[PDB]
Amino acid sequence: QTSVDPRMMALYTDVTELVGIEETRDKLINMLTEGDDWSKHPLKTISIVGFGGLGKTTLAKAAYDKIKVQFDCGAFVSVSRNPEMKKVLKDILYGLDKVKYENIHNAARDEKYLIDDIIEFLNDKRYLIVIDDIWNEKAWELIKCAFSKKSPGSRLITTTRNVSVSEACCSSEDDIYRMEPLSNDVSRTLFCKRIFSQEEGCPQELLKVSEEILKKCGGVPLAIITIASLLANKGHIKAKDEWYALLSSNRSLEQMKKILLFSYYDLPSYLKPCLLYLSIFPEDREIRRARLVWRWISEGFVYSEKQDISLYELGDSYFNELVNRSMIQPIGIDDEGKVKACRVHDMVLDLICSLSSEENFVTILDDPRRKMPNSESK
Amino acid sequence: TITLEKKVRKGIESLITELKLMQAVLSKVSKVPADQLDEGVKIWAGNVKELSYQMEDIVDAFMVRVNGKDLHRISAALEEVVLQAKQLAELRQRYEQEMQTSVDPRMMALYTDVTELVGIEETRDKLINMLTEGDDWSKHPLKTISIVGFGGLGKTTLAKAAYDKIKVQFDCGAFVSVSRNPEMKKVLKDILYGLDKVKYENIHNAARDEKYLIDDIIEFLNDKRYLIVIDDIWNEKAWELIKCAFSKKSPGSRLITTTRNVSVSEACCSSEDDIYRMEPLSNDVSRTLFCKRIFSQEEGCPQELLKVSEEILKKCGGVPLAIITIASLLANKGHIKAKDEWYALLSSNRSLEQMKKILLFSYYDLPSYLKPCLLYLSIFPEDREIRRARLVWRWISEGFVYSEKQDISLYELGDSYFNELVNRSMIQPIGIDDEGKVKACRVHDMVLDLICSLSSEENFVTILDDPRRKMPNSESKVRRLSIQNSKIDVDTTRMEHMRSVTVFSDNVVGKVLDISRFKVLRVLDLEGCHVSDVGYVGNLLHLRYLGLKGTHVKDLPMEVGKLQFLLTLDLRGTKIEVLPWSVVQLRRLMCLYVDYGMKLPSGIGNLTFLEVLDDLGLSDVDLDFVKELGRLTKLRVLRLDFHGFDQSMGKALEESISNMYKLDSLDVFVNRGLINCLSEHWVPPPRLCRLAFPSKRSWFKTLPSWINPSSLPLLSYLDITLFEVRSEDIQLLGTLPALVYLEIWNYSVFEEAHEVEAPVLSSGAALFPCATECRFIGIGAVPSMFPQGAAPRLKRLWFTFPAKWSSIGLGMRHLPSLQRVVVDVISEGASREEADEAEAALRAAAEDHPNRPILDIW
Ligand SMILES: Nc1ncnc2c1ncn2[C@@H]1O[C@H](COP(=O)(O)OP(=O)(O)OP(=O)(O)O)[C@@H](O)[C@H]1O
Ligand SMILES: Nc1ncnc2c1ncn2[C@@H]1O[C@H](COP(=O)(O)OP(=O)(O)OP(=O)(O)O)[C@@H](O)[C@H]1O
């Protein structure tokens, strides 16, 4: 049969296991209400952006559960990558009132009548609605119709991985919240709590390997949690040399890989090679963009049939699109007014290296790891 | 050599069958919108198209040229093309692996805010008045209104506005939309659910046939007033079925329908007064919409942008969809773009994709045999207008028009194709031809861009402009070429397989390119160019259309007799005087345009199949010529000149004319004097439909006797100048059944010194059925002409009135439909004091009429 989205179980995680939410939760809550007469201003929309595994839907869920009391009706809907609009509208309706629209998932009407139902139900009410995991523009363009009328005091929240989608949702660029990774102390406490759960005392021999591992994670809660479960080995903590072996180099790991690969399976077909090409450069350094663009043009990944196009600006567009989908961190400003360099997360780099190795796209030569392929003549 | 002949025949028959199959497949493919095809099928279809072109060329070569060398070349080409076909088949089979739906883009527009519509109030109130129209509207029978126009014009918006405004004064209503390929069950369920959301709340899950749903609708509407809107009807069967639910009679109920097709609207409404034709916005309204959309708050356009703004607004054409999309494109909500960027856009995103997808519905709906005929319009320049006869003859020459019936003329098929294109609101017709049909046509500019892109993606047509649209980067096989900017230079050494060349340049460099190398041509069109002489027209052997109009050609090579296939030969405005004799030997020839100053050779009787002959000389000609004229039997248009023609032999000419059974139009031009032909006891052809004598200085005597409505049952046009008109001559014209148009001159009033005599009509009613215009130039009377109310369709009247008759009444209430009157007064007999008296009198007589026509005294 078909499997279920691995991100669904995370909605049933206990609340006493979240480390550093209070600050961000209260900041978002203040961004929503913001005043004493917030219940008299026009409808507002907030959006949250970042890369996968950063903790967006967790924060939205926290704020929603905290302040849902001060409204009349609300819902918490999730849109996937390839959505069916009927399903989304039925989900909204069933979330607004479980009794009246109890059998709404069996009705067979088109989108116009479902939108009319949503409009009629929301007349003269304050509502708080969260829409999750939007992946492109058409979906929002259609769902926006149900919130066309004006309603003083109502609020919308959306979460996404794509930046242009967030610019299209919100009106002002002050209504965008950018998720950012945890600090070092918070990450360390999460780690300890996750593994040394009760002692919360790290032995000394493990300190420096712990620090290098935490640096490799980068403050992303998903990676921290998965590696902590890997090293926990609930029966027994592993040995120091085994920690070293892991650093140099299961269900949770498969889940993390499957989750991160959503952004790769979503790219247009002409952008997949341009991404794998990043597995040529070493780990932590940064890459000049001009080098990348000229090498892409030389390899033959950039072409068009129009008569009046310059390949340089096509390549630049490809680079900006890769940055747009939150798969690359830009750094600095070039001497011609553009980005200077780019960085890549380390787990993403490992995924890319494995993907590109499974197809003879690139062969790397390190002595400890990644030696010559055993049986390959080409 | 006997064996070779037998083999080539077999190969050709095989190719013909294969061509049929390939065309079936391609037509099947070309229906799917581009978003549902996969790349494999698309690539394979392109290659199949190319092979089809090659095989057509081989078949044509065999048909024309049939010796040893020819048969050898043909056998070689046959073998090669068969091999290529097999190879492509294997290639497709090698990489075949088997391994949601979007929403209508027009749906979001129903949720647009109402404060963003600019100029609705007037049209909205006009439609509302067309619906109610009175105080007792709630007691008249059921009425149906329809709205027509092209896409993006604002039909459903207007319907929605009126509906929301007046829905209160009814009991029940609904707003349903039918798509292109509808399911009738879904439409009926939609109506039911719209009428009552509570009772029929779960109606979309019921599973009954159409009969029971129709019965439910009929039972619910019993004893109620309802207002129902039905949207986006695309053909006739849908309405034919939905009409059954509104079969009973219900006083006070109303229906509205909106559509893009004209025949559908004629089938919905009863009277042609219940049709609303949407028309684009004016210039001021369009400009305010533009500004509002972009400069939203300032509403102040900077000066440097004024003229580019005006050119852009002219290109949009007043269609709200285009205005809105281009305004969003130039807005760039972050920042208004720069002036040079505006220029770049003018010379040359989500909203743009949506607009293209919306406009392409009318293209994906055409029958398969009409899609090429539309793409062919991408050959002509942007804003000019196109003659329809040119189009029709070029379509026939290219091979787009064919049928298997035995008794059909391709000219009327082509005319039907043109009228169908006009019917679907994809072409704007302009003017009236000299044979009673449309003259020219225009195309919207965005539609033109869409057509150009579509036709370019398939090597259908290659255009040559220097700034944009240069030679294709990697293309060795070009079939149809269109030269518009003579600045470019052409290679024309790889273009072996041309089919059609057209030059639009007044420029000298236009005549520079060599033509004798295109050994396979079908259409040569040099109309307007300044070429001087063409001796290479022979040795082409494949032509079908030779268009030389308005060129400086002095004389033709006496080798045109070799072109055994030549449908059209157009010589007008050239400097030719005598046609070469070998012209007689063009057995397949269907159209001959020529000036009356050119000498035709003798044996013209051999040119059977002639369907159109223009401006015969008829001067310095013997009798056997006028007798030969009687052999062209299937001839539908004729024009004569009678210039030097001796009027002693008119009887033979009239017999030869009476011999042509199929015939529609006829002209006779005579300089002066009395016309000494077409005597009485003539028996005109039965199907005649248009007759004209544009002389205006050569009169008939009293009237031809053969004008009785039995001999000419069909007639919709007439133009005669009589010597002296009687009173019981207009009577005979009243007897004529159709007679849409009419124009009579009285020769004695002007050239002689006779005076205007008042004609009186008597003994009858309904004298002029279907007479929309009448110009009695030389004779006039308003009341006594039309007693009891006759000609209840007239719209323009021309008559003369002496000032003597100031002391007959000018009451214009006999005639309801009057809209325009043109008068001229003769003031020498009566004094000025009677003159201004009569002027004010007829002015008041025009003012009392409810329609309030316009006057002109002259
Ligand atoms: N502050 C935190 N403390 C502990 N765990 C956290 C915290 N924030 C997030 N997590 C954990 O991170 C995991 C993934 O987070 P989440 O799925 O909310 O990120 P996301 O932005 O929704 O990812 P995606 O963009 O793929 O939907 C969850 O299992 C959650 O338990
Ligand atoms: N008077 C107006 N002012 C502003 N916008 C208008 C006006 N009329 C129409 N529009 C806009 O034009 C767009 C298309 O109009 P509409 O779809 O009603 O035309 P239509 O005749 O229904 O087209 P189709 O024949 O394809 O259904 C709509 O988005 C509407 O907002």
PDB file of N, CA and C and ligand atoms in Angstrom, chain B residues 106 109 112 116-120 149-158 231-232 260 281 289 293 320-321 324 358 361, ligand 2:
ATOM      1  N   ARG B 106     -10.725  30.760 -14.988  1.00  0.00           N
ATOM      2  CA  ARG B 106     -11.746  31.791 -14.937  1.00  0.00           C
ATOM      3  C   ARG B 106     -12.557  31.752 -13.660  1.00  0.00           C
ATOM      4  N   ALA B 109     -12.080  34.766 -10.954  1.00  0.00           N
ATOM      5  CA  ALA B 109     -12.613  36.079 -11.279  1.00  0.00           C
ATOM      6  C   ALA B 109     -13.968  36.334 -10.645  1.00  0.00           C
ATOM      7  N   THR B 112     -13.548  38.485  -7.392  1.00  0.00           N
ATOM      8  CA  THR B 112     -12.985  39.822  -7.452  1.00  0.00           C
ATOM      9  C   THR B 112     -13.904  40.808  -6.743  1.00  0.00           C
ATOM     10  N   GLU B 116     -13.674  47.391  -7.783  1.00  0.00           N
ATOM     11  CA  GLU B 116     -12.589  47.462  -8.744  1.00  0.00           C
ATOM     12  C   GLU B 116     -13.070  47.418 -10.181  1.00  0.00           C
ATOM     13  N   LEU B 117     -14.373  47.493 -10.408  1.00  0.00           N
ATOM     14  CA  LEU B 117     -14.909  47.529 -11.755  1.00  0.00           C
ATOM     15  C   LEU B 117     -15.173  48.972 -12.148  1.00  0.00           C
ATOM     16  N   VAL B 118     -14.808  49.322 -13.376  1.00  0.00           N
ATOM     17  CA  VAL B 118     -14.729  50.726 -13.751  1.00  0.00           C
ATOM     18  C   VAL B 118     -16.031  51.233 -14.351  1.00  0.00           C
ATOM     19  N   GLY B 119     -16.437  50.670 -15.479  1.00  0.00           N
ATOM     20  CA  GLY B 119     -17.517  51.282 -16.223  1.00  0.00           C
ATOM     21  C   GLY B 119     -18.768  50.455 -16.394  1.00  0.00           C
ATOM     22  N   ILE B 120     -19.241  49.812 -15.331  1.00  0.00           N
ATOM     23  CA  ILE B 120     -20.367  48.901 -15.481  1.00  0.00           C
ATOM     24  C   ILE B 120     -21.723  49.603 -15.463  1.00  0.00           C
ATOM     25  N   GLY B 149     -19.837  37.654 -27.634  1.00  0.00           N
ATOM     26  CA  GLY B 149     -18.607  38.404 -27.775  1.00  0.00           C
ATOM     27  C   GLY B 149     -17.429  37.460 -27.716  1.00  0.00           C
ATOM     28  N   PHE B 150     -16.241  38.043 -27.752  1.00  0.00           N
ATOM     29  CA  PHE B 150     -15.036  37.237 -27.653  1.00  0.00           C
ATOM     30  C   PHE B 150     -14.614  37.087 -26.196  1.00  0.00           C
ATOM     31  N   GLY B 151     -13.601  36.257 -25.974  1.00  0.00           N
ATOM     32  CA  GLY B 151     -13.174  35.965 -24.624  1.00  0.00           C
ATOM     33  C   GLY B 151     -12.511  37.153 -23.958  1.00  0.00           C
ATOM     34  N   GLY B 152     -12.647  37.213 -22.642  1.00  0.00           N
ATOM     35  CA  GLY B 152     -12.061  38.287 -21.879  1.00  0.00           C
ATOM     36  C   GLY B 152     -12.775  39.608 -21.988  1.00  0.00           C
ATOM     37  N   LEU B 153     -13.983  39.628 -22.531  1.00  0.00           N
ATOM     38  CA  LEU B 153     -14.683  40.876 -22.769  1.00  0.00           C
ATOM     39  C   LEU B 153     -15.490  41.351 -21.575  1.00  0.00           C
ATOM     40  N   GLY B 154     -15.876  40.458 -20.676  1.00  0.00           N
ATOM     41  CA  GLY B 154     -16.600  40.866 -19.491  1.00  0.00           C
ATOM     42  C   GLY B 154     -18.061  40.482 -19.492  1.00  0.00           C
ATOM     43  N   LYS B 155     -18.384  39.307 -20.024  1.00  0.00           N
ATOM     44  CA  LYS B 155     -19.779  38.903 -20.113  1.00  0.00           C
ATOM     45  C   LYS B 155     -20.299  38.388 -18.778  1.00  0.00           C
ATOM     46  N   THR B 156     -19.625  37.394 -18.201  1.00  0.00           N
ATOM     47  CA  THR B 156     -20.101  36.834 -16.945  1.00  0.00           C
ATOM     48  C   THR B 156     -20.043  37.857 -15.826  1.00  0.00           C
ATOM     49  N   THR B 157     -19.120  38.812 -15.901  1.00  0.00           N
ATOM     50  CA  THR B 157     -19.087  39.874 -14.903  1.00  0.00           C
ATOM     51  C   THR B 157     -20.360  40.700 -14.940  1.00  0.00           C
ATOM     52  N   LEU B 158     -20.799  41.074 -16.137  1.00  0.00           N
ATOM     53  CA  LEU B 158     -22.024  41.848 -16.268  1.00  0.00           C
ATOM     54  C   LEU B 158     -23.233  41.042 -15.828  1.00  0.00           C
ATOM     55  N   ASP B 231     -24.267  29.882 -18.258  1.00  0.00           N
ATOM     56  CA  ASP B 231     -23.027  30.543 -18.598  1.00  0.00           C
ATOM     57  C   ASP B 231     -22.164  29.632 -19.451  1.00  0.00           C
ATOM     58  N   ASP B 232     -21.505  30.209 -20.450  1.00  0.00           N
ATOM     59  CA  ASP B 232     -20.421  29.540 -21.152  1.00  0.00           C
ATOM     60  C   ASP B 232     -20.921  28.322 -21.931  1.00  0.00           C
ATOM     61  N   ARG B 260     -19.751  32.548 -26.492  1.00  0.00           N
ATOM     62  CA  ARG B 260     -18.835  33.088 -27.489  1.00  0.00           C
ATOM     63  C   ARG B 260     -19.291  32.845 -28.916  1.00  0.00           C
ATOM     64  N   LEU B 281     -14.472  48.641 -24.120  1.00  0.00           N
ATOM     65  CA  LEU B 281     -14.551  49.927 -23.453  1.00  0.00           C
ATOM     66  C   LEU B 281     -14.063  51.043 -24.370  1.00  0.00           C
ATOM     67  N   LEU B 289      -9.006  52.747 -16.063  1.00  0.00           N
ATOM     68  CA  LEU B 289      -8.759  51.413 -15.530  1.00  0.00           C
ATOM     69  C   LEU B 289      -7.268  51.139 -15.430  1.00  0.00           C
ATOM     70  N   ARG B 293      -5.303  50.654 -11.867  1.00  0.00           N
ATOM     71  CA  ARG B 293      -4.616  49.392 -11.626  1.00  0.00           C
ATOM     72  C   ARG B 293      -3.139  49.559 -11.257  1.00  0.00           C
ATOM     73  N   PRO B 320     -10.848  44.212 -21.383  1.00  0.00           N
ATOM     74  CA  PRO B 320     -10.383  44.316 -19.995  1.00  0.00           C
ATOM     75  C   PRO B 320      -9.348  43.286 -19.601  1.00  0.00           C
ATOM     76  N   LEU B 321      -9.418  42.072 -20.136  1.00  0.00           N
ATOM     77  CA  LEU B 321      -8.454  41.048 -19.751  1.00  0.00           C
ATOM     78  C   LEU B 321      -7.037  41.466 -20.114  1.00  0.00           C
ATOM     79  N   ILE B 324      -5.785  44.424 -17.947  1.00  0.00           N
ATOM     80  CA  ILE B 324      -5.434  44.025 -16.590  1.00  0.00           C
ATOM     81  C   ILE B 324      -4.113  43.268 -16.569  1.00  0.00           C
ATOM     82  N   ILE B 358      -6.435  30.996 -21.335  1.00  0.00           N
ATOM     83  CA  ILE B 358      -7.844  31.332 -21.495  1.00  0.00           C
ATOM     84  C   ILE B 358      -8.176  31.561 -22.957  1.00  0.00           C
ATOM     85  N   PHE B 361      -8.835  28.535 -25.623  1.00  0.00           N
ATOM     86  CA  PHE B 361      -9.996  27.648 -25.609  1.00  0.00           C
ATOM     87  C   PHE B 361     -10.672  27.619 -26.973  1.00  0.00           C
TER      88      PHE B 361
HETATM   89  N1  LIG C   2     -15.697  46.782 -16.292  1.00  0.00           N
HETATM   90  C1  LIG C   2     -14.636  46.095 -15.828  1.00  0.00           C
HETATM   91  N2  LIG C   2     -13.740  46.671 -15.017  1.00  0.00           N
HETATM   92  C2  LIG C   2     -12.682  45.996 -14.555  1.00  0.00           C
HETATM   93  N3  LIG C   2     -12.430  44.717 -14.848  1.00  0.00           N
HETATM   94  C3  LIG C   2     -13.253  44.024 -15.650  1.00  0.00           C
HETATM   95  C4  LIG C   2     -14.427  44.690 -16.195  1.00  0.00           C
HETATM   96  N4  LIG C   2     -15.062  43.791 -16.947  1.00  0.00           N
HETATM   97  C5  LIG C   2     -14.353  42.643 -16.887  1.00  0.00           C
HETATM   98  N5  LIG C   2     -13.277  42.787 -16.113  1.00  0.00           N
HETATM   99  C6  LIG C   2     -12.276  41.750 -15.825  1.00  0.00           C
HETATM  100  O1  LIG C   2     -12.070  40.943 -16.974  1.00  0.00           O
HETATM  101  C7  LIG C   2     -11.744  39.625 -16.567  1.00  0.00           C
HETATM  102  C8  LIG C   2     -12.421  38.616 -17.472  1.00  0.00           C
HETATM  103  O2  LIG C   2     -13.783  38.981 -17.630  1.00  0.00           O
HETATM  104  P1  LIG C   2     -14.881  37.842 -17.823  1.00  0.00           P
HETATM  105  O3  LIG C   2     -14.228  36.541 -17.495  1.00  0.00           O
HETATM  106  O4  LIG C   2     -16.108  38.252 -17.077  1.00  0.00           O
HETATM  107  O5  LIG C   2     -15.133  37.857 -19.399  1.00  0.00           O
HETATM  108  P2  LIG C   2     -15.924  36.652 -20.071  1.00  0.00           P
HETATM  109  O6  LIG C   2     -16.753  37.205 -21.184  1.00  0.00           O
HETATM  110  O7  LIG C   2     -16.552  35.880 -18.961  1.00  0.00           O
HETATM  111  O8  LIG C   2     -14.757  35.767 -20.701  1.00  0.00           O
HETATM  112  P3  LIG C   2     -15.045  34.285 -21.228  1.00  0.00           P
HETATM  113  O9  LIG C   2     -15.828  34.495 -22.488  1.00  0.00           O
HETATM  114  O10 LIG C   2     -13.677  33.719 -21.445  1.00  0.00           O
HETATM  115  O11 LIG C   2     -15.822  33.631 -20.124  1.00  0.00           O
HETATM  116  C9  LIG C   2     -12.257  39.474 -15.158  1.00  0.00           C
HETATM  117  O12 LIG C   2     -11.153  39.166 -14.320  1.00  0.00           O
HETATM  118  C10 LIG C   2     -12.781  40.820 -14.756  1.00  0.00           C
HETATM  119  O13 LIG C   2     -12.203  41.171 -13.506  1.00  0.00           O
END
